[PDB]
Design a binder for this molecule. Structure first.
Ligand code: HEC
Ligand code: HEC
Ligand code: HEC
Ligand SMILES: [Cu+2]
Ligand SMILES: [Cu+2]
Ligand SMILES: [Cu+2]
Ligand SMILES: [Cu+2]
Ligand SMILES: [Cu+2]
Ligand SMILES: [Cu+2]
Lengths: 456, 456, 456
């Protein structure tokens, strides 16, 4: 007999439990094969990919990644794909782990307002990516059409305290990283495999700050980790921790005691972690510019007792978490909305600048702007700043080096350029600085920065 | 004793069986070590990399990938490399799995019209890439100079019903993807790892349509899978199926029951598949823009009985196979030749357009141009098209959105731009549309499209 | 108990042995857990990334990669990070394998002239990358802030004859590959993952020529192999040899008998090799343009007796090692310094050209400039060259094809363009050619080449 040869479906049909990320459906907890009816609906919708940056996502079930599907090896799955009548595109589905043409894609082609169905036996146990397979396939996947399906072994997976759902994807916007507004898909960037964002669960900050995953010291955590791509291979890593186990798809091989593991485009793995020390543990793609310049960071926050014999030291994690150490960056979202409305206040800018100043500036100038005498000059009550507050725009954009004097102290160092910052970002940061620490006040606009950036 | 310590060569020397892709030489079927004489000749030659796109390939044995070499662990191999006198470049060979300097490259340097020889013992069992290692090494590999050598274990590999030879490579043309004509190698793209094509066996469509690999339900298939690079790592995947086994090079580890596996640049693996359900099973690099935008798709076609208990659904695989669902795209080849000759007819364009319309347009407008009332507007007898057939060029290149009326029905949707299409492609597709379904006829030329593309 | 539950530290504290690449500290050779005090100092310093190309590296311990740290599983490590007062940036450290927030980064933030300390228990055996984790994290890593820490199993690793330390990194210069002078970090290239250099141990030629690693026939070699990134995944390969074992981080899985293995960004592996045949064995990233166009080649040189039954052939390894076959390229370094000083002589240029001519030109024109009658035309006493020595600049930059006559012999072949060569390189090569083999003498300057390159 084939694999999953467990007998005919028994009992009543089961109408399947789908879940939204980062959560997983419960274990099926049964010892017999069932007929499982799955209903999944495609929805095309604008969502925020980053604070003040909107994108038209194409979704399975209203989320990126799509709704999580959980069945048992040997089940017969009757799959219903609906395409919402608001959709502009046709869609379909390819489930990895399906035995058949297109993994279902050949049978699930569904126009807006229609529904398709096909049936498959889940022969292969494992964790599997599913995704849309409608031409142009890459555009559909790039727009967010991917998720996971778990096919349990017949005895179920071992019990753990938490199960979570995390999926990486690469995204291609016409605009640059953190450029505000509704950003179109960019086919040229996509073909060249040059993403503007690389994210977990469809957005910057999806799993950071107040949206972190949780567990307690001593608890076990299983994460179902997908890589939807379309194009990147993840050097998937947990900062400050180790994986007890890493298992790809339905593979017989299991790797144990590793921290860094390569996930193919379209690949999926199950990882397991045991919490040992409190704090924030960071899931990243260790192709590091993805993690720290394009959004590829997610957090597991562990609460419980300290273990000073295992780890003893200070906890200044804003030095690397930067602007994602805080609970959120809602001040940026709000400043952007107010700017679109034409109602942007000085305070709107100050609070957005405060959020962005973390990491970006604070690593050298400190959270309080004091700097460090002789090494980093102060922004707090800075005579150099007050002498020519406009020149601060050039300093941020193009850097500063050479001998300067600030508040009666000599400096001879190097501030790197930060040209990657967008005009609103520079404007907001500088407005924050001007309105803090007894600086002269006033404001810098995005338009001011635009003019300075354009100077030869 | 070293590995492969099986005794001295016995018997008469064996003059080795080389094969062209996608076929493999027979199992050596012997229990003793032999002296094996291998003769391989380099040939530089123009071949079609895509329909109407020529490239000057540099080849081992006249093909990309090069001729497959099959020996037994413990054999002594006397390797003769000839370089055809028509060659312009010198060449050599590095066989992975060889124990010695350059894997042979140090001893096989061969000018045009010359022959070299070196001898090695095959100590290491496994599947191995070989390639040219002549400066500039990357240019030689990019031009197609790679293949596989199998070193069998002494007892042979387990018997299977079919053995096939598939090798991925990344290619670098001065022109864009599907731009017609003789395309030079592009060193700048190659250094930047920005390929224009990513292919199996040296050409788009090498293993699709009427050139698919075959097997029957119940049969086992072994594929020797190489990645010649030069630069890309393949997220190697089979759509709608699973690999029973994946083994890299001569490694002791074997992974079982996986669908997606990472093959390094210069890597090789042996995969095994058991056919379970009829249909087309697609080998891809799941860095998806490679598979669906740059040519990285190959097909294994399985014939036999349906198994509706395992898979039950419709078979509309043109939705993802697109223009590669058909037996071939020879109409494109022919239209391109006629265009070069100055003898391009309306019918030449119509048939080339018909081939390209599959996937590219048919996913929304349907194979018969009818569209779907209220959702996708018709191209069949389209009053909107007839009203300004020229505007169709702008629609294809730059998309269309907003409210329009077509054949007495209102539409308010979005047709994405398709700027990646080349001028001949747009011209041919539109000529096909104009001459089908009682549309007004006439034709669009590549030159017409060029003018429209150049408008600001 | 956790992992590494071996008891409390015993004995006196041990002040740890750090080593500079390519060497490793000795095995700890003990059976009890210790308190180990580690002192590591950050130094920012200019070094040569390539001959005549300077870069401002940021280093742990004065080298790239940083000093190697070696402890035993179950040790308590008291980590002191100093930041030299000459530093312009703050720094910190994240050690993979540490159980705690940021792998230490949260507790080791250190301004110039300061010192930090934190303590951790080494629970996890394995080889691990460490790196700086100070915002912007990618810039710090790109500038060279990474190394390895080995956490031994309690019984120690098996004995071998040699242990070496090799770490790959990708680097991002404003200038192009081999463009001379002090090269700034290029943030735009880094974000796009488009490195100008890909190196082992921080420099082109760090481990080639007279800086090769050594062993003898019959000896075992262990290499601790890191990939610091920041961005690339290495298709890590040894030319002409095989790895007996490859083990990632602290993983339970060990792969045996492979030649090509994928190392994630931020990953580390221990590989083992047994020397069998004399010669030069090349460690490369087999994304081949990295290895042969961006510096990603290192050498293990094996001395001892020939084994003609295993490998019998000539040894012309300059065909692929090119300009790295020689002991060094010091003539390039010297010519560049003299050019900066305004004291560049004809002889300075001749010797620099001689070094660069290897591989680059010699593969076709031969080491003695004789070429091959009818196939490659001579540079030795070339009438074609003497007829218009200036035209040689265009020939190098833009190639040459078609019918020509040289020293009374007809040629009809193709010399590819070599536009990637920098102006000084072309000038030096041509000066070498003009002053060798009874050619007319004189010289070509970088400024001459610049003018020709700029012609339309
Ligand atoms: C990596 C260190 C570092 C970072 C990050 C950094 N700076 Fe600076 N900044 C400096 C140094 C050093 C100087 C002094 C330069 C010199 O010696 O020529 C400086 C100078 C300045 C000055 C002028 C002198 C003064 O004290 O008024 C301003 C204004 C300033 N920085 C603002 C910012 C802002 C705003 C940010 C973030 C957007 C930022 N800097 C990020 C190191 C840094
Ligand atoms: C993903 C869906 C999709 C694809 C693929 C697509 N179209 Fe369209 N096309 C549309 C939609 C929707 C409209 C109507 C746009 C609107 O509502 O503003 C349209 C409009 C048009 C029109 C004008 C209206 C009409 O019916 O005459 C033409 C002509 C056309 N398409 C031709 C093509 C051609 C040729 C191709 C392929 C090269 C193509 N389209 C590919 C969705 C698509
Ligand atoms: C891959 C082969 C190859 C390489 C590498 C190469 N050449 Fe050539 N070179 C040729 C060929 C072939 C010709 C003749 C072209 C023709 O037939 O039109 C040529 C022609 C020339 C000529 C003009 C004819 C003559 O003999 O004087 C010069 C000068 C020359 N090469 C110099 C160089 C220099 C300097 C280098 C390296 C920087 C170089 N070449 C690298 C193949 C090569
Ligand atoms: Cu879709
Ligand atoms: Cu897929
Ligand atoms: Cu070659
Ligand atoms: Cu190789
Ligand atoms: Cu640092
Ligand atoms: Cu790290």
């Amino acid at each position: 007999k084939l694999p999953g040869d467990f007998g005919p479906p028994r009992g009543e049909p089961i109408h399947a439990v789908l879940t939204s990320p980062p959560l997983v459906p419960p274990p099926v907890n049964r010892t017999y094969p069932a007929k499982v009816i799955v209903e999944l609906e495609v929805v095309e919708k604008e969502m925020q990919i980053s604070e003040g940056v909107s994108y038209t996502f194409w979704t399975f079930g209203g989320t990126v990644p799509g709704s999580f599907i959980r069945v048992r090896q040997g089940d017969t799955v009757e799959f219903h794909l609906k395409n919402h009548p608001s959709s502009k595109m046709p869609h379909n589905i390819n489930l990895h782990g399906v035995t058949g043409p297109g993994g279902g894609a050949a049978s699930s082609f569904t126009a807006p307002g229609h529904e398709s169905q096909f049936t498959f036996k889940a022969l292969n146990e494992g964790i599997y990516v599913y995704h849309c397979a409608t031409a142009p396939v890459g555009m559909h996947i790039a727009n967010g059409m991917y998720g996971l399906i778990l096919v349990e072994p017949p005895e179920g997976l071992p019990k753990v305290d938490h199960e979570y759902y995390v999926m990486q994807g690469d995204f291609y916007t016409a605009g640059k990283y953190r450029e505000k507004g509704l950003q179109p898909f960019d086919m040229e960037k996509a073909i060249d495999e040059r993403p503007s964002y690389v994210l977990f669960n469809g957005a910057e900050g999806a799993l950071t700050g107040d949206k972190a995953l949780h567990a307690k010291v001593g608890e076990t955590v299983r994460i179902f980790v997908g890589n939807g791509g379309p194009n990147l291979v993840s050097s998937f890593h947990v900062i400050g921790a180790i994986f007890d186990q890493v298992r790809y798809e339905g593979g017989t091989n299991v790797q144990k005691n590793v921290q860094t593991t390569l996930i193919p485009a379209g690949g999926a793995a199950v990882v397991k972690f045991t919490a040992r020390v409190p704090g924030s543990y960071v899931l990243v793609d260790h192709s590091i510019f993805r993690a720290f310049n394009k959004g590829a960071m997610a957090i597991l926050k562990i609460d419980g007792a300290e273990n000073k014999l295992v780890y003893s030291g200070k906890e200044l994690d804003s030095v690397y978490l930067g602007d994602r150490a805080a609970p959120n960056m809602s001040a940026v979202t709000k400043a952007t909305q107010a700017s679109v409305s034409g109602t942007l206040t000085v305070q709107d800018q100050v609070q957005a600048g405060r959020a962005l100043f973390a990491g970006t500036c604070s690593v050298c100038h400190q959270g309080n702007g004091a700097g460090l005498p002789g090494v980093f000059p102060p922004l707090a009550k800075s005579d150099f700043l007050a002498a020519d507050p406009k020149r601060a725009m050039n300093i941020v954009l193009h850097g500063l080096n050479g001998k300067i004097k600030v508040n009666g102290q000599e400096y001879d160092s190097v501030m790197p350029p930060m040209t990657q910052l967008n005009d609103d970002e520079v404007a907001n940061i500088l407005t924050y600085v001007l309105n803090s620490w007894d600086n002269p006040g006033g404001r810098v606009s995005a338009e001011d920065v635009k003019k300075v950036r354009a100077q030869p």
